[PDB]
Amino acid sequence: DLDVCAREPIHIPGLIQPYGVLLVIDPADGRIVQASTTAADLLGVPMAALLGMPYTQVLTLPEAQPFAVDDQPQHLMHAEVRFPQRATPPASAWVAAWHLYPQQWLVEMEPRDARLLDVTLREAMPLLRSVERDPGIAEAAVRVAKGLRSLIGFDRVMIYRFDEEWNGDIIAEARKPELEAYLGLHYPASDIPAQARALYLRNRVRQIADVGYQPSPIQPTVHPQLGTPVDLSDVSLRSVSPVHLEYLANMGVTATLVASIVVNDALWGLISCHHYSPHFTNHAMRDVTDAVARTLAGRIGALQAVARARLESVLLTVREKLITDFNDAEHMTVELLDDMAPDLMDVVDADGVAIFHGNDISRHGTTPDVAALRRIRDHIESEHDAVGALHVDAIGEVFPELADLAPLAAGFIFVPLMPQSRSALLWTRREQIQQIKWAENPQLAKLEDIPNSRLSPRKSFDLWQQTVRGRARRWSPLHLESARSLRVLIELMERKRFQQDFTLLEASLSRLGVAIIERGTANAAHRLLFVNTAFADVCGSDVAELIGRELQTLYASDAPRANVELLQDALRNGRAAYVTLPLQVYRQFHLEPAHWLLQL
């Protein structure tokens, strides 16, 4: 309640959802040791008589049987269950699922079907086949929400995406026109506790048939000879926290079906179905919903793989241009930087870029004012894994003097392009509040609170807005690396500008393994000043991906060693080392001396 519920043990509630029946069985004699209150009317045997009876006397299993487990628990899927002690058979056919653990057996039973018609895999396959051919995550998510709304009959279907902090974003939505649109709403991580999140990942599909259900207590409560509560981590009939029930009741929601979106074994988000009237989702439709979630997750991870590859090639194109369009000599490395500005932003997913050249500042995306850009660099200057670049995700938390610049520079990446020079580069990101899709849902601004409520979508949207205030989406170590490797390449080219300029590079490029190595002037390290195509072919990396790299980064192969110190003493003094060692494959390293001429 209020705060303590963040660490509520929602897996041992001692209650179940009354639409089904649960039994706890002793795996050696088959005696029922514990049972839900709903077991007495279903099996037709009084609760007192039932507790201490073998399951074979009260229920019949024509299909799969329970078997003793030793190591990993086994879970038998839902199959036909009959009741021999009933005076009359039940109105609906019942189905049973087994959760077999080494010392305990759990049998959860529910009706085979709803008062609705069953949707099969065959009816779902066009949706599945379509989701697989969708061009974007947004298209795929919208298609699912609409699809799952038609297949299963839900009033609302929403797609959530979790951020790194586990905050939720309603990226897609499908609903009855009359319903309030929550698309574009974000909620804080605290709204779904870590155990709730863990169970959704574990369960795959989780339902709430009737929010206003009368909880069915597990009786006797604690195991008669072990004294432990029933762990319902795998039981789908598991009761829901009275906090969540209060949330849904305020909303008018009477049923929910939540399915996991698991991308690369991790929880990416969820599919949440909300009904405004009771809705039992049978085992067959739950299996279909599961198959729909797997397909959407499959597509996301595919579109996320294509996206990485796209970015990697864009990054390599800006590196290729930085080396080739610098060799013009009479063209500033800050001038072509201004032309590349949209690609510069893409490489680190920046909302804007500011190119510094003394007092001259050139803004490109969504960046603060020139006076605010001056303030940022000037405050950084006065302050004077391993990346040679300053970055922040919340400007006011690190530099409270610049706190008022959080709307357009909540997060930034600062790289001085020569610390000797007043030339630099500032990538910016706006605060998370700025990114709210008001356009995609004009009703969001107009979204009002539930009066008399302790919990609501309005309260949750406010809480999130409060938590992410003055903070940008965090910079990935990937995006962080790209910026340091750009600063390395820019400064290397800016050092190449005044350190022995020659036509020898053009003569070395023409001929066939060949690379020029800069000494580095007793600091940072010895880098690849220039490289040839054959050198990149033997290495495996690209000509622009290899220029700027370290000499130690070449033989990133740990296995050789032996020498290393013999190569380092020729680097630390400026002499020659004709020692052969492998790279990424065994090749000969022929170093010859300000700059070294290496070939392999």
Ligand X SMILES: */C=C\C1=C(C)C(=O)N/C1=C\C1=NC(=C\c2[nH]c(/C=C3/NC(=O)C(C=C)=C3C)c(C)c2CCC(=O)O)/C(CCC(=O)O)=C1C
Which parts of this chain interact with ligand X (CB under 6 A)? 5-6, 10, 182, 185, 187, 190-193, 196, 206, 240-241, 243-244, 247, 256, 258, 272, 455, 457, 460
Cα 50 to Cα 23, 41, 47, 424: the distances in Å are 10, 11, 5, 78
Cα gap 91→94, rounded to integer Å: 9
Q: Which amino acid is at 454?
A: R
CB of 299 to ligand X, least distance (A): 21
CB of 258 to ligand X, least distance (A): 5
Calculate the dihedral angle through the C-alpha atoms of 220, 248, 208, 264, rounding to the nearest 10 degrees. Answer: -110
Phi, psi of 547 (to 5 degrees): -80, 125
Closer residue to ligand X (CB): 180 or 320: 180
CB of 152 to ligand X, least distance (A): 14
Q: Can you list the positions of beta strands (E) in 220-265?
A: 255-263
Cα gap 334→356, rounded to integer Å: 8
Q: How many residues does the chain have?
A: 600
CB of 244 to ligand X, least distance (A): 4
Task: Please state at what angle helix 137-151 crosses helix 283-324, rounded to 10 degrees.
Answer: 170
Q: How many beta carbons lie within 10 A of that of residue 373, not counting itself? A: 23
CB of 247 to ligand X, least distance (A): 5
Cα gap 272→269, rounded to integer Å: 10
Cα gap 284→325, rounded to integer Å: 61
Closer residue to ligand X (CB): 165 or 397: 165
Closer residue to ligand X (CB): 157 or 337: 157
Cα gap 263→121, rounded to integer Å: 22
Cα gap 480→333, rounded to integer Å: 21
Cα gap 302→486, rounded to integer Å: 28
Contacts of 528 (CB under 8 A, 6+ apart): 515, 516, 517, 546, 547, 548, 549, 550, 551, 554
CB of 241 to ligand X, least distance (A): 4
Establish whether 5 is an annotated binding residue. yes
Closer residue to ligand X (CB): 66 or 188: 188
Nearest 5°: the CA angle 517, 522, 528 is 20
Closer residue to ligand X (CB): 128 or 257: 257
Closer residue to ligand X (CB): 258 or 318: 258
State the chain's maximal CA–CA distance in angstroms.
100
Contacts of 435 (CB under 8 A, 6+ apart): 473
CB of 463 to ligand X, least distance (A): 9
CB of 93 to ligand X, least distance (A): 26
Cα gap 529→505, rounded to integer Å: 10
CB of 207 to ligand X, least distance (A): 9
Closer residue to ligand X (CB): 168 or 396: 168
CB of 187 to ligand X, least distance (A): 4
CB of 267 to ligand X, least distance (A): 12
Q: Which residue has the tokens 């989702």?
A: 281
Q: Name the residue whose CB lies closest to ligand X.
A: 5
Closer residue to ligand X (CB): 38 or 460: 460
Closer residue to ligand X (CB): 146 or 458: 458
Sign of the torsion angle spanned by Cα atoms 363, 367, 368, 374? negative
β-pairing, 411-416 vs 515-518, is unpaired
Closer residue to ligand X (CB): 236 or 485: 236
Closer residue to ligand X (CB): 34 or 260: 260
Closer residue to ligand X (CB): 11 or 78: 11
Task: Please state at what angle helix 283-324 crosses helix 477-496, rounded to 10 degrees.
Answer: 10
CB of 457 to ligand X, least distance (A): 4
Cα gap 537→546, rounded to integer Å: 11
Tell me, letter by letter, the H, E, C secondary structure of 350-408: CCEEEEEECCEEEECCCCCCHHHHHHHHHHHHHHCCCCCCEEECCHHHHCHHHHHHHHH
**Binding-site sequence positions:** 5
Binding site per annotation, positions for biliverdin IXalpha: 5
